[PDB]
Amino acid sequence: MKIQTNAVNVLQRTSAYLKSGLLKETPAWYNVVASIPPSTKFTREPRFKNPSNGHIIGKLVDVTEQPHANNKGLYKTRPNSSDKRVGVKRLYRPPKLTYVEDRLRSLFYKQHPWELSRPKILVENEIGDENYDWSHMLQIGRPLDGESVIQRTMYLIKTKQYGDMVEAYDHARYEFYALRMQEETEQQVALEEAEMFGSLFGVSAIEHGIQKEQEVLDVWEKKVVEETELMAA
């Protein structure tokens, strides 16, 4: 769509109306818009750095800055055909944001597919209210999930307590297991202790599933019988 002119210049056209006398009374917005001008450039703006990983956008390494033989043993003595092509488009293409955590988020849930069955709430409470010390995994205001493992891993890396991401990730994994075993034992023992004092529950999870299966299976029986009778004819 053509860059529109008549939405951002309402003040100028209104002032022409007022000066000519076509409009008698000044509108209520007139002085407000006069004191707060709209942005009227509507330009494409280049970018020179990827915000996420800090990679510089728009630098060409020269042959002088590659004085050493490449992996195939050949020196670089002249520019290649990629260096000679103007790369202005990269300056305007919105950069792809990248985080190592995402590679480490994919791994965790490949190693623990049943951690995907733990429901997650994506509704944020307030990102500014978070004050976490990742020296430990449990945090007040957070659940225990894969992100706890990964944030602890990143903490361990940035403090150089481990040099390799693999070892930090494994350490975080074992702390996560330590906490999960405690939680599951807490749940089981809480239920056991509740039953030992006369807690009378109604439908459990197993009975819930049984009743839903029954609801589905009744309709399935009816359809099967109807289809068999129809097929016979």
Binding site: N31, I36, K96
Partner: protein, 196 residues
């Protein structure tokens, strides 16, 4: 989604992540403060403010913004021609004289006064992509407008864009509540000086 990008919104974008474009929230904050100040200034001047949003669950926020700014809202449907054909559409509905304190005077209006166009001083649209008619009418009727500009929306169609997500009711209600509070503060200042 990056597949639905309107490239004229390039300068508002921070990057792409998970197959969608991320809006640069520093720019969103700057534009939002500018638009909020425009709303506050218009409410402080006693002008008419209209809140337009025609998506499903936006009625509550629009009504509350209107009621705390002493403004007006539409959420059902924007009748095309509501501004450029105001006589044929809005001419029949009733009008009212009010004092500096927004107190009904209960004066009897002439039929000629009742028949006049009463044009908004400010239009804020929460879903400008589905409200092109309103934007074009505001341009023709020369009404400054504010809108939430998503990655697929044309920025130049509004006077005061706010880059942001127009698809989430939480984001829309956050921005709308900010503008409504700015209008409320302008109204409170107007009443304060009119009580002094």
């Amino acid at each position: 989604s990056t597949s639905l990008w309107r490239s004229s919104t390039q300068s508002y974008i921070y990057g792409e992540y998970k197959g969608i474009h991320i809006i640069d929230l520093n720019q969103t904050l700057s534009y939002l403060k500018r638009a909020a100040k425009v709303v506050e200034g218009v409410s402080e001047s006693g002008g008419i403010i209209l809140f337009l949003g025609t998506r499903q669950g936006q009625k509550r926020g629009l009504e509350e913004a209107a009621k705390k700014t002493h403004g007006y809202y539409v959420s059902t449907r924007w009748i095309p021609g509501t501004l450029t054909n105001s006589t044929e559409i809005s001419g029949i509905w009733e009008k009212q004289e009010i004092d500096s304190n927004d107190n009904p005077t209960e004066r009897a209006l002439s039929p000629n006064e009742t028949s006049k166009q009463v044009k908004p001083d400010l239009l804020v649209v929460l879903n400008p992509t589905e409200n092109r008619n309103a934007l074009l009418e505001a341009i023709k009727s020369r009404v400054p407008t504010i809108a939430i500009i998503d990655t697929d929306s044309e920025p130049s169609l509004v006077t005061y864009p706010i880059p942001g997500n127009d698809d989430s009711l939480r984001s829309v209600n956050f921005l709308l509540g900010v503008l409504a509070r700015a209008g409320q503060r302008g109204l409170q200042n107007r009443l304060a000086r009119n009580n002094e």
